[model samples]
Target: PSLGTKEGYLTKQGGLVKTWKTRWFTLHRNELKYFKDQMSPEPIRILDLTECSAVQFDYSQERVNCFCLVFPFRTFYLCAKTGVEADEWIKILRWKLSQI
Candidate 1:
């Protein structure tokens, strides 16, 4: 769950908050047309890793940062930590094949 502190303990915003609780890192649906509507090609796959780093070119200069890669890694990390298994990954793959 995601938590954020707006101010301090004196404020309601500072109170502990519960964020999204997803059962799976990659959700699978048998219905191809329906699943296609929900899925995006930009973020194609989710990898299993503790953390990630990225390098990009900005204004003809290479810039390296961990935050960009960490975002996706964090999602998968949470999924694995929450008990998602290899079988779940296979389920997503099988579902993708049905789309083709």
Candidate 2:
């Protein structure tokens, strides 16, 4: 679900929260390669906390969980848990895409 608007997306627990507090930065291909080489030894874990796992696989959970595992050096978090910070990146990407 796209939490593009708080009016339509807010829940009883409140809106999503961002896990990473850092701002985004652009990296050149070589920089990314070096960063990846330096960080590839780390491992990431994501546990299933909900008792009633959805009848069908939850796409959002799968996406983020697998992403964390495959790219352990890169940061990943639940957007619903990280509202504004997550939305900020989304907005930035949307604005950038619109310019293209």
Candidate 3:
């Protein structure tokens, strides 16, 4: 609640392959990172939103609550607790992008 980054828990799929895993999300400026957990030292995946476009919702991908985050560097299929959570993330990310 102190740092200028948005941190939360979001279920994510593998970057290179197809695999689902719950990850800790850390978004700073226009760059977002995923970690095994909040305490982890390294990020498993990274998405630079500066070169990106939007975070879209995926209706039929995995479960009902999923999102398709589009970026020039990497695109990720993110799942949340529910649709509302996913939408909130999109809003938060959009706001972050605007701050840039």
Candidate 4:
């Protein structure tokens, strides 16, 4: 939890499919990266914080701890294990967006 950094596991919806899978998400610098697992060598994708338009709570009937990252052309949906965790992520992400 150092300055400008947050890392944890979250369930993220697939890019092309509706399946949700656990991913290792890390927010550092101006990028948000996700790996398949903690041991993975490379990230699956790196979301540029500069291009992100919004980060806010998203409705989900299956889960209450859900939020979304909005881009110009797409959005990424993620769910945390608890409401507090979700709030922290949303807050930190929004703070980072403000910095950029």
Candidate 5:
């Protein structure tokens, strides 16, 4: 088994608004789950990599270090603290999506 996990805090933009929320996210297996924090009782959101069609950097926003996940029904825009971090996330997610 070649199971690995990536977990961290990232700022996520809401679906219906420009508002951003900082949450704890964990990438393991085929799911990228997020919670209020590391000790949250349940995940606030779970992004299934199997359903993700694309993962790439975003430039529409004025803010720096932005990327997005493309799904069949929705797109998730996420921002990392730094451009380097955002690139790493996009690369990893794109690879996982390709595998699926």
Candidate 6:
């Protein structure tokens, strides 16, 4: 993983009120995972980016300040800290895919 641990807010939007929460993430060789905190060893969920294709959507009117990560179980939602951060993650993920 190039980026060891990226800290940001991931969407917790399944509830009645749309919300987001902080998570520690690791963009690995073929997967990206999120943990509750830096101390937690277990990940909340694991999404294989081999099929994820860089993990983003067309930042449009349907949802702003967020993007989608398509996983087998569910389409995860992510909120990048900045516009540039989203691009960076996508680029990094793409590079990882290319290497594989």
- TM-score of each predicted structure versus truth: 0.19, 0.27, 0.83, 0.94, 0.89, 0.66
Error of 5 at 45 (Å): 1.4
lDDT of 1 at 65: 12
Best by TM-score: 4
Best-fitting candidate, scored by lDDT = 4
Local distance difference test values of all predictions, in order:
0.24, 0.26, 0.81, 0.92, 0.85, 0.62
Listed per model in order, the count of residue pairs whose N, CA or C atoms clash below 3 Å is 0, 6, 0, 0, 0, 0
Candidate 3 per-residue lDDT, tens place, 1-100, comes to 6445678899887768889888999988767888999999999877787766877788877578888777776678889998788887888877776766
For model 2, residues 1-100, the per-residue Cα lDDT tens digits are 3332211111111115532322122222111111112234431222221211111111354223111211223333323235443454344333333433
Per-residue alpha-carbon lDDT of candidate 5 for residues 1-100, written as tens digits (9 for 90 to 100) = 2445688888888887869888898899789999999889899988899888888888887678889888988988889999988977787787787677
What is the full ranking by TM-score, best candidate first?
4, 5, 3, 6, 2, 1
Angstrom error at residue 33, model 4: 0.2
Error of 2 at 65 (Å): 12
TM-score of 6: 0.66
lDDT of candidate 6 over 48-79, digit per residue (tens): 77766445654652345666666565666666
Q: Which stretches of candidate 4 lie over 4 Å from their true place?
A: none
Question: Relative to the unseen true structure, what is the C-alpha lDDT of residue 55 in candidate 5, on a scale of 0 to 100?
Answer: 86
Off by over 4 Å in 2: 1-59, 62-81
As for candidate 1, its clashing pairs are none
Residue pairs clashing, model 6: none
